[PDB]
Amino acid sequence: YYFDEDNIWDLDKFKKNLKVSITSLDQETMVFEISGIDASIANAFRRILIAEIPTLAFEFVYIINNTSIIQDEVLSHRIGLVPISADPDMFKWFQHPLPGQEATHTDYDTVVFSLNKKCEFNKNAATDEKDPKRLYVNSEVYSGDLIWKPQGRQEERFADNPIRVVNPDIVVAKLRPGQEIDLEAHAILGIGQDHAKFSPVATASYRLLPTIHILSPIEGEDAVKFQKCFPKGVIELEEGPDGKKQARVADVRKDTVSRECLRHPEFADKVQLGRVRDHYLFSVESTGIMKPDVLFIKSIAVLKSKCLAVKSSLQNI
Amino acid sequence: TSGDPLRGLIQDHVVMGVWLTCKDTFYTRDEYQQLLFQALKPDETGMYGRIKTLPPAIQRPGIYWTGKQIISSVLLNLKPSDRPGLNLKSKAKVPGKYWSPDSEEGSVLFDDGELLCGILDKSSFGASAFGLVHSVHELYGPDIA
Amino acid sequence: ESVLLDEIFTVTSVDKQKYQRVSRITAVSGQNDMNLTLDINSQIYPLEKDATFSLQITSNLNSPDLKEAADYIMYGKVYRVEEAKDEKVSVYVSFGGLLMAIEGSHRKLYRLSLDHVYLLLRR
Amino acid sequence: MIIPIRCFSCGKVIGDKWDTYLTLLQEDNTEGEALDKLGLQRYCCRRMILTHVDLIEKLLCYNPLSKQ
Amino acid sequence: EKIIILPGHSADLTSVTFQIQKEDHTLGNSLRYVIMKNPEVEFCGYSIPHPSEAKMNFRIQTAPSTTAVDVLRKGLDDLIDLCDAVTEKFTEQLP
Ligand SMILES: [Zn+2]
């Protein structure tokens, strides 16, 4: 039983030591620095970003006619993989069908998309040019053809933001004259831990900020070598009237931990690369769903909610 | 066919044993508690109410348990109801010289259940007798081994 | 009182043998009949050549002299004691892997036993 | 067969990022670096639309309903 | 059954093993971190029997003064306050 007396929890001191800065934010990508947070909370934020927060995806697929080349289960799978733009909290969860299975759809739970394309021959083509985009009409079954079908109330629920596919240019299948695809996909809410197609954010991960410090200042042509080792920008050759050339670490955030120097025979004395233990550099690139701001906010929201859940179910006992 | 033990821990477990028993490894409170608990896993195996630990090998200015201290902690928390502590001295596999000319690891020596000196390897626990796991099988009986 | 050593020491050699962390140091002192070689955390407590010691091996670490003194504190059993070459005792204290070796001519090194220690090194 | 939508390691979508990759080698005289203009910085999502065999365009020329 | 106390709990409720279902390291690790900031706790480490079945064995040993249930309660409140601070600073950052 030994506590070290400096590990005391204190919300004021923690909140004061914590610092956040947002390097860049776009409609898709977001890169920002958290600091003053122990590793496990960073692991938790990453996990909730990838796994735990919900987002609609195509679960069921009812094919009415499919004579295409693509296997039917493959086509259902690949349709399921496409992403859909709808704020996943506008819906409820799907109560999964135990025995007594049929009557398990409602307008708040699931949304339906439908497509159908029959590739018919295009006769205007002069010669043989198997594009095939020009030889045949409706040749490539795109994603953008998955045209949503409103189910009752929904037509006015999402009138401001139509429930559409995220990327109208994804390829779903390919056809030639004669065959047809016709199906409707039932989309429900999902939790990424069960299947990957639910996970809103594609790529969310962090780096511990590297630290480069020069023990002994290098000189001359070695300054060129040292600038050359790390990628551009992070190593400047100082304009010093004393002597001729040195090198100092401008801004390491761009650098990768690549550890190229330590292989050199002469440099190994002069530089170490360490890691600021409480500076965390998140990067989050969305897929098609939501502004990454809402992603991170809702992620810490989800942690709060799961903690509330365990708190209450404990309070029962 | 002979007496030597045929079971044992294997590849990842043994080289990570050489990395945990090594004296260069230090753990704080959080990692030590977590690791000891992951090693024991009481409830599913059972038999115990509350786990008992050892004091930290080095204490000031930061409390840092050492690895051999953790192997000793395990050896303790599997101690039978009332059986006197283990003691053993036997040669390890990794010869000491790899560590240092005249390094002391060499041969695992632990009295009263505490890895005083000597890192664990194939010989200490594996397909080699007169190590840890074999003497534990002798003293404490097989259902403990 | 159960203090077992209060000798002063000075460092003579330090390595640093394939360990970025803890490094053995040798600190013979007294009238040179004190062959002290120990291990220390060379990451959180630096020790260099001729850095003076204040070494105290107690038994029960309950006193304000703990906080006042003891700028570095260890713990561990002492497994082997021998009388070798003379009326000369060599003691070997383990510290959870970290080892020790201290030699005296059976004097100033009297009460050393086969128990736990709580070494205290105050620079 | 068709391009593996949602590349394996990462989660980026690359379905639509082949028919616009192919008409870069086709008519831009560029090398394999062409895909860098598409917004693929990693090398997991880059070994997908680079070294993928589009083995459907060789398979769709097998309709039994050829009518010929 | 979200949280159920496994049958090894000492009568004093000083060494209890919470078992949170449908959870993995995601909450276990951070909760352990927040709990270890609490001085009156002696031992707090989390495990998983088998990752296939989503059951997280928790475990807390406490000081005789306060039982472990109150420790877990305060730890969860503290984790919630941590998320509160994070969301506060974050939503301050952008417009
Ligand atoms: Zn990828």
Swiss-Prot record, chain A:
Assembly behavior: Component of the RNA polymerase I (Pol I) and RNA polymerase III (Pol III) complexes consisting of at least 13 and 17 subunits, respectively. Interacts with RPAC19/RPAC2.
Similarity comment text for this entry: Belongs to the archaeal Rpo3/eukaryotic RPB3 RNA polymerase subunit family.
Species annotation: Schizosaccharomyces pombe (strain 972 / ATCC 24843)
UniProt-recorded Gene Ontology molecular function terms: DNA binding; DNA-directed RNA polymerase activity; protein dimerization activity
Cross-referenced Pfam families: RNA_pol_A_bac (PF01000), RNA_pol_L (PF01193)
Function statement: DNA-dependent RNA polymerase catalyzes the transcription of DNA into RNA using the four ribonucleoside triphosphates as substrates. Common component of RNA polymerases I and III which synthesize ribosomal RNA precursors and small RNAs, such as 5S rRNA and tRNAs, respectively. RPAC1 is part of the Pol core element with the central large cleft and probably a clamp element that moves to open and close the cleft.
InterPro entries noted in UniProt: DNA-dir_RNA_pol_30-40kDasu_CS, DNA-dir_RNA_pol_insert, DNA-dir_RNA_pol_RpoA/D/Rpb3, RBP11-like, RNAP_Rpo3/Rpb3/RPAC1, RNAPI/III_AC40, RNApol_insert_sf, Rpo3/RPB3_RNA_Pol_subunit
Protein name: DNA-directed RNA polymerases I and III subunit RPAC1
Lineage: Eukaryota, Fungi, Dikarya, Ascomycota, Taphrinomycotina
A cellular component annotation (GO) from this entry: RNA polymerase III complex
UniProtKB/Swiss-Prot annotation, chain B:
Localization annotation: Nucleus, Nucleolus
Transmembrane segments: none
Organism superkingdom: Eukaryota
Function as written in the Swiss-Prot or TrEMBL entry: DNA-dependent RNA polymerase catalyzes the transcription of DNA into RNA using the four ribonucleoside triphosphates as substrates. Largest and catalytic core component of RNA polymerase I which synthesizes ribosomal RNA precursors. Forms the polymerase active center together with the second largest subunit. A single stranded DNA template strand of the promoter is positioned within the central active site cleft of Pol I.
Complex formation: Component of the RNA polymerase I (Pol I) complex consisting of at least 13 subunits.
Family: Belongs to the RNA polymerase beta' chain family.
Protein name listed in UniProt: DNA-directed RNA polymerase I subunit rpa1
Lineage, broadest ranks: Eukaryota, Fungi, Dikarya, Ascomycota, Taphrinomycotina
Gene label: rpa1
From Swiss-Prot, chain D:
UniProt cross-references to PROSITE patterns, sorted A to Z: RNA_POL_N_8KD (PS01112)
Protein name: DNA-directed RNA polymerases I, II, and III subunit RPABC5
InterPro entries registered for this protein in UniProt: RNA_pol_su_RPB10, RNA_pol_suN_Zn-BS, RPABC5/Rpb10
Gene: rpb10
Major localisation: nucleus
Intracellular or extracellular location(s): Nucleus
UniProt organism field: Schizosaccharomyces pombe (strain 972 / ATCC 24843) (Fission yeast)
Keywords, ordered alphabetically: DNA-directed RNA polymerase, Metal-binding, Nucleus, Transcription, Zinc
Subunit architecture: Component of the RNA polymerase I (Pol I), RNA polymerase II (Pol II) and RNA polymerase III (Pol III) complexes consisting of 14, 12 and 17 subunits, respectively.
Binding site for Zn(2+): C7, C10, C44, C45
Classification of source organism: Eukaryota, Fungi, Dikarya, Ascomycota, Taphrinomycotina
Swiss-Prot record, chain E:
GO biological process annotation, one example: transcription by RNA polymerase I
This protein's GO CC annotations: RNA polymerase I complex; RNA polymerase III complex
Source organism superkingdom: Eukaryota
UniProt-annotated location(s): Nucleus
GO molecular function, one term: DNA-directed RNA polymerase activity
Function: DNA-dependent RNA polymerase catalyzes the transcription of DNA into RNA using the four ribonucleoside triphosphates as substrates. Common core component of RNA polymerases I and III which synthesize ribosomal RNA precursors and small RNAs, such as 5S rRNA and tRNAs, respectively.
Entry similarity comment: Belongs to the archaeal Rpo11/eukaryotic RPB11/RPC19 RNA polymerase subunit family.
Subunit structure: Component of the RNA polymerase I (Pol I) and RNA polymerase III (Pol III) complexes consisting of 14 and 17 subunits, respectively.
Protein name in UniProt: DNA-directed RNA polymerases I and III subunit RPAC2
Protein species of origin: Schizosaccharomyces pombe (strain 972 / ATCC 24843)
Lineage: Eukaryota, Fungi, Dikarya, Ascomycota, Taphrinomycotina
Gene: rpc19
Portion of the full-length sequence here: 20 to 114 of 125
